[PDB]
Design a protein around this motif. Structure first.
Motif, PDB file in Angstrom:
ATOM      1  N   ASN A   1       1.958   8.920 -17.634  1.00 33.38           N
ATOM      2  CA  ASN A   1       0.551   9.181 -17.601  1.00 33.38           C
ATOM      3  C   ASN A   1      -0.142   7.636 -17.575  1.00 33.38           C
ATOM      4  OD1 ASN A   1      -0.085  11.775 -17.095  1.00 33.38           O
ATOM      5  ND2 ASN A   1       0.467  12.345 -19.130  1.00 33.38           N
TER       6      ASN A   1
ATOM      7  N   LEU B   1       5.066  -6.914  -8.733  1.00 33.75           N
ATOM      8  CA  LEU B   1       5.648  -7.298  -9.885  1.00 33.75           C
ATOM      9  C   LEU B   1       5.524  -6.107 -11.031  1.00 33.75           C
ATOM     10  CD1 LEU B   1       6.675 -10.347  -9.524  1.00 33.75           C
ATOM     11  CD2 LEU B   1       4.665 -11.324 -10.653  1.00 33.75           C
ATOM     12  N   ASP B   2       4.346  -5.547 -10.937  1.00 32.93           N
ATOM     13  CA  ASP B   2       3.825  -4.473 -12.000  1.00 32.93           C
ATOM     14  C   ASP B   2       4.764  -3.122 -11.465  1.00 32.93           C
ATOM     15  OD1 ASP B   2       2.229  -5.433 -13.901  1.00 32.93           O
ATOM     16  OD2 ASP B   2       0.660  -5.460 -12.437  1.00 32.93           O
TER      17      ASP B   2
ATOM     18  N   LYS C   1       0.758   6.184 -14.216  1.00 31.82           N
ATOM     19  CA  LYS C   1      -0.138   6.618 -13.312  1.00 31.82           C
ATOM     20  C   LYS C   1      -1.517   6.141 -13.176  1.00 31.82           C
ATOM     21  CE  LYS C   1      -0.493  11.604 -12.547  1.00 31.82           C
ATOM     22  NZ  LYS C   1      -1.871  12.117 -12.357  1.00 31.82           N
TER      23      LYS C   1
ATOM     24  N   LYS D   1       0.749  -1.375   0.155  1.00 31.33           N
ATOM     25  CA  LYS D   1      -0.119   0.021   0.176  1.00 31.33           C
ATOM     26  C   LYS D   1       0.819   1.270   0.165  1.00 31.33           C
ATOM     27  CE  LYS D   1      -3.371   0.050   3.084  1.00 31.33           C
ATOM     28  NZ  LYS D   1      -3.786   0.711   4.360  1.00 31.33           N
TER      29      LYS D   1
ATOM     30  N   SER E   1      -9.383  -0.601  -2.169  1.00 31.18           N
ATOM     31  CA  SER E   1     -10.479   0.127  -1.587  1.00 31.18           C
ATOM     32  C   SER E   1     -11.731  -1.157  -1.960  1.00 31.18           C
ATOM     33  CB  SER E   1     -11.050   1.366  -2.240  1.00 31.18           C
ATOM     34  OG  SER E   1      -9.997   2.414  -1.910  1.00 31.18           O
TER      35      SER E   1
ATOM     36  N   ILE F   1       3.909  11.940 -10.612  1.00 29.17           N
ATOM     37  CA  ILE F   1       3.616  13.265 -10.518  1.00 29.17           C
ATOM     38  C   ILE F   1       4.813  14.046 -10.725  1.00 29.17           C
ATOM     39  CG2 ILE F   1       2.326  15.246  -9.460  1.00 29.17           C
ATOM     40  CD1 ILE F   1       0.851  12.756  -8.069  1.00 29.17           C
TER      41      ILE F   1
ATOM     42  N   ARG G   1       7.505  -2.960  -9.745  1.00 27.59           N
ATOM     43  CA  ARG G   1       8.813  -3.257 -10.179  1.00 27.59           C
ATOM     44  C   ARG G   1       9.370  -3.068 -11.594  1.00 27.59           C
ATOM     45  NH1 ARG G   1      10.904  -8.783 -11.531  1.00 27.59           N
ATOM     46  NH2 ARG G   1      11.153  -9.441  -9.586  1.00 27.59           N
ATOM     47  N   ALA G   2       8.476  -3.529 -12.252  1.00 27.92           N
ATOM     48  CA  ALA G   2       8.292  -3.490 -13.607  1.00 27.92           C
ATOM     49  C   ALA G   2       7.948  -1.964 -14.218  1.00 27.92           C
ATOM     50  CB  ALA G   2       7.304  -4.432 -14.529  1.00 27.92           C
TER      51      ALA G   2
ATOM     52  N   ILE H   1       6.267  13.937 -14.331  1.00 31.81           N
ATOM     53  CA  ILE H   1       5.414  14.511 -15.070  1.00 31.81           C
ATOM     54  C   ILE H   1       5.806  16.357 -14.993  1.00 31.81           C
ATOM     55  CG2 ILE H   1       3.156  15.649 -15.400  1.00 31.81           C
ATOM     56  CD1 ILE H   1       2.326  12.196 -14.861  1.00 31.81           C
TER      57      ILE H   1
ATOM     58  N   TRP I   1       1.323   4.421  -3.271  1.00 36.02           N
ATOM     59  CA  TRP I   1       1.149   5.840  -3.063  1.00 36.02           C
ATOM     60  C   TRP I   1       2.384   6.577  -3.243  1.00 36.02           C
ATOM     61  CZ3 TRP I   1      -3.195   8.223  -2.999  1.00 36.02           C
ATOM     62  CH2 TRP I   1      -4.248   7.628  -2.694  1.00 36.02           C
TER      63      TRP I   1
ATOM     64  N   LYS J   1       2.816   6.817  -7.302  1.00 40.43           N
ATOM     65  CA  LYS J   1       1.825   7.905  -7.804  1.00 40.43           C
ATOM     66  C   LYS J   1       2.599   9.132  -7.523  1.00 40.43           C
ATOM     67  CE  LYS J   1      -2.957   9.499  -7.310  1.00 40.43           C
ATOM     68  NZ  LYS J   1      -3.845   9.603  -6.470  1.00 40.43           N
ATOM     69  N   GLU J   2       3.048   9.496  -6.528  1.00 44.14           N
ATOM     70  CA  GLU J   2       3.861  10.638  -6.261  1.00 44.14           C
ATOM     71  C   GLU J   2       4.990  10.872  -6.932  1.00 44.14           C
ATOM     72  OE1 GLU J   2       4.733  11.672  -2.059  1.00 44.14           O
ATOM     73  OE2 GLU J   2       3.030  10.552  -1.240  1.00 44.14           O
TER      74      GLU J   2
END
Lengths: 207, 201, 208, 208, 206, 210, 211
Positions: free
Chosen positions: C126, C182-183, C129, C83, C140, C94, C185-186, C97, C87, C90-91
């Motif tokens: 993008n 896995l994703d 992201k 988790k 969620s 940004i 890391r990739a 970008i 996050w 994702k940060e």
């Protein structure tokens, strides 16, 4: 051309002439007056609230320990009565501008394609404001049903303080959205005037 | 038709004021907010709010909303609205700079439309933020309402604390995005302003 | 147009961002790439028998003529590991970008090819992201769905299919959370390679 | 900026480890898998003549003008065979993706055709992953839907259509799970053939 | 024999379309613009629209609750106008499609005009069908509104929204007439100005 | 291609698949095409009066100023379903077979002679469109039982409403009509596949030539 | 070319020939008869109702002061029994025309592309008609469930007149839609005939193989 009766051409013409006069009237007198009138409304205090806690309406729900009459927000209602007729009147004027420009579309002809391309661009722009204006009406309809379900949930389940906190939040969310609405409407009227005015020459006769 | 001019002039002054003074100040002010401790929490368990729901035994009071999130919301929420407003301002500005649609020199107007579609994409994302905030209260409310009604199911309890963590993380991402959005707008407009004011030359 | 305060305020951020991005690319990214691939070695993420994942279900079986129901600890412990990784990426998406967009030059007719490279790298980030945000909506989805599952299983004691799905959600979550690392890391690896190999053109699409 | 002696070596260890993994998967794993499932397709549980034998006992009292209802064992035993196969392919799809993307060279104007091949193979693997993820959402759909089916059938005893559909879901699941194995076999086969025949261009799109 | 039965319909349709275009359309255009003059559609104070609610206010079972008469009377005026246009849209469509010639490589431009006019008429029909789904939305939504307001007497926002739906409906129904007028007008102008090319995209005479 | 006798074992599958596809195309497909068109002749699928489809409902009618017995499913539809349902599944399976076949016939992506491969992709996208429609049929069948169930459950709970009763009979008619359309479609799909593959087979096996 | 068993080639051919005869039969005899038959139906009084208040069915729900069996609208039911089989029979014929045109698609060949483009246009048109006619069936299915939920709501809550008014409104909405359906169906059959008839030459042989 087109087949027409002596009576049928006269009844087509009266409307056509009446519409053109309406559009030319709207563009010259109505639009500048409106542009100002709402920007003047934006000055009024009800739309420029410093503390958003003043928006908060009384809730009167009994706190549980380990129902009466719950009124709707007056401040929002008074605001709604100001923005709501403005949304409708623009949507109406969008239809008017559309009917106008479409009656100015000439015979589809191979000669001089560029002029008609201008007409279609202005038209698709007006359609895009109408779409946004209709998105505003669906935001207003969303307010009452959502605030209603909010207080209904908050009263039924007294123990949860998050339901109570969202009702006040919806009012703030509505207020902010309704404020954005006026700014948008002002910008929309302004945008239409500028796009039509600057290009009017080509809009009346693309040929 | 000089009554249209006052607005036009007032708008241009507003936009030029926003671009020069407001935007750089904002850019800094939120990046300074990002330094504050409430937005840089090490242990996310400190976010967790008390739940006070009676555990059942094999053969309710009042449940407060998360104060920490509420205090955070009061900081990010007005920032979302103020940007959405400024997006509208920039839009009204660039559109009043669109000249007569003319066959001569197409390239200049193409630049204006690109900057405009970019600002619209920022507004779209900002409106997606407001619908995330509205989603928080109704979802946390339904969460505690479910957790109190059905006391026996402990995953209902665990999600309420999870929503607060999910909200926190999203609200943190929001500030970063808003900073990046203000920054992005400044850079795109500043570097191209020359062509933006007169696409024709 | 520039003013005395505006000159400083923009530059400090710009310089700070560029330093941040160059720091992230050189130090952070390779360390992360390894750190999670090292996490993938840990036993909690490489479970042979998925029946060991199964959590106790305290439900009385009906007979032909309820207390506490805890969550899966194993999944909770796993969630606490994946988790924060979702996050933090994702940060960083940004950050990359904001970086590439500040490297987009004046839109000019001369030398179109260079800017086209910048837009491709940008659309790629993008897309990463978008997938990362699709991961958060999967997380969620887990708690609300497992909650509704045990709530249905307890209310209707007679149906054995409800009981069977709660254990299935935990297996479905586990498998998805494994795929997530896995994703991730990739994704980190993919970003490094795309930026590194093209950096030359990314910093100056024009040249000089 | 060039990286430290430990920094790039840690980028390298992963890169080398991944390439070895992919080359290992392609040569040994894939052909073995292709056969192993096609051999599974021979097994009797997946080739049922009479679908009425699938039907599970329902024990719901017929009304005149409830105990506990077990899940379908036959489907559960089948699910335990197909389900790990779905996950393992999804994992291998990610592996192939990470592999091909590390083989994408510097975006360069010279020799565009080669890179176009790489993107086609990549979009194909992504389409396989999409279908595999569509399989997992079909499996998740089974338990919740069969659960709601028996819950409705027990609550409203008088309606036969509820009872009839529970047996129908099991048949619908069986048929779908059978189609799943065929698809997975075809997917593994398709991947092998597309990569094998084009490998030359896949490793170096630039040539030489 | 089979051609004789196709012919009667074909001829009957063409006469219908030519009749609609010349007589019906101009009359309709005026008739609704004349309706727009009527007072029921030009209400100054929208509070006059408000219908009585008679729900007992609680203090810290239920009587008969009628629908809004004013909206009902308005609905009975706009509603048949929506249906009659949708019907005429189908008529124009059947007409233009019978004027599409043999798909031939020679002279592509003419047929392109026919397809544009046709796609326009289809876009009008789509909007008209969007109007019918707005009307259907009114009764079910106002019904659920009063049903919620009566069941839960304590919540004001339910009662306030019932009056709001009537205002929202009124405004939408007003916009409907304007649109319908504009649609009829738009069709006339697009067909009239291009009719030459619409009847023969190829250019022939006998 | 480094190690393993298993390369002779990807051959066994390849050869087995090609034989399967060539077998399906020549023997199975024409037999199927006929077999269903022969099914379409049968009386259960050509019902004149759709009122004969109607199943008994036995729900007590209320009286103006009492719980229900046992409510059976529509036998006629069940018997029909048992005929169309295995046909839907068997086609979906054969769609996968044709797909696996054509994809193993896709050659090395090469700049020389692009036209041939374009034919292969068109036939392939067509078969995928058939599979999509077949999967849309299965979701129509799944929709029937849950919807008829909720219909009788609503009709029994609220006895006073006759339209609830009326829709149950309507679902059966709606299902019947849809199931009839299904067999027509399946016949047309098998027929369509045969014709598209047969007429183009030459180019399908070798898009390059040689 | 394609390899064929003697039995299989006989079995492919019988169907092929049977289908072509079916399509040629449908186009020449059935279609013109249908075109007329419905336009004749459109003349009938049940489909041309002046006062839509005559459609209104009795409701018998007790008005509250400050039960029973509720029958379905017979007029709509009688109308439905007329339009409903017409929707199904067209959907069937759409499939027939589709199977026909697709068997007329030749070998995909680089020579003479224009002819095949015509075939695909006619085909996509027939598919658009089928789509609309499937949209009609989902409108019919929508009627019974919606009218049912309407009377169920109106009976449960007697005090709300809006529920009661909507039931009568659904019947009017259905009637109007069902009237539009016949017009559309007539137009669809007519449209198909005209598009196929005028282009048939090219439809049978896009290559222009000598007749």
């Amino acid at each position: 051309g087109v087949r027409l009766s002596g009576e049928a051409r006269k009844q087509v013409d009266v409307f056509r002439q009446n519409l053109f006069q309406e559009a030319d009237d709207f563009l010259c007198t109505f639009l500048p007056r409106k542009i100002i009138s709402l920007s003047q409304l934006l000055q009024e205090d009800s739309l420029n609230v410093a503390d958003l806690s003043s928006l908060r309406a009384p809730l009167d729900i009994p706190i549980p320990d380990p129902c009466g009459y719950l009124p709707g927000n007056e401040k929002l209602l008074a605001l709604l009565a100001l923005v709501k007729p403005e949304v409708w009147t623009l949507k109406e004027k969008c239809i008017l501008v559309i009917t106008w420009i479409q009656h100015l579309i000439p015979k589809i002809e191979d000669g001089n394609d560029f002029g008609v391309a201008i007409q279609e661009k202005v038209l698709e722009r007006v359609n895009a404001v109408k779409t946004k204006v209709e998105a505003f009406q669906t935001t207003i309809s969303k307010y009452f049903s959502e605030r209603g379900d909010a207080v209904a949930k908050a009263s039924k389940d007294t123990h949860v303080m998050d339901y109570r906190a969202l009702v006040h939040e919806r009012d703030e969310a509505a207020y902010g959205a309704l404020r954005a609405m006026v700014l948008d409407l002002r910008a929309f009227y302004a945008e239409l005037y500028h796009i039509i005015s600057s290009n009017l020459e080509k809009i009346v006769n693309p040929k």
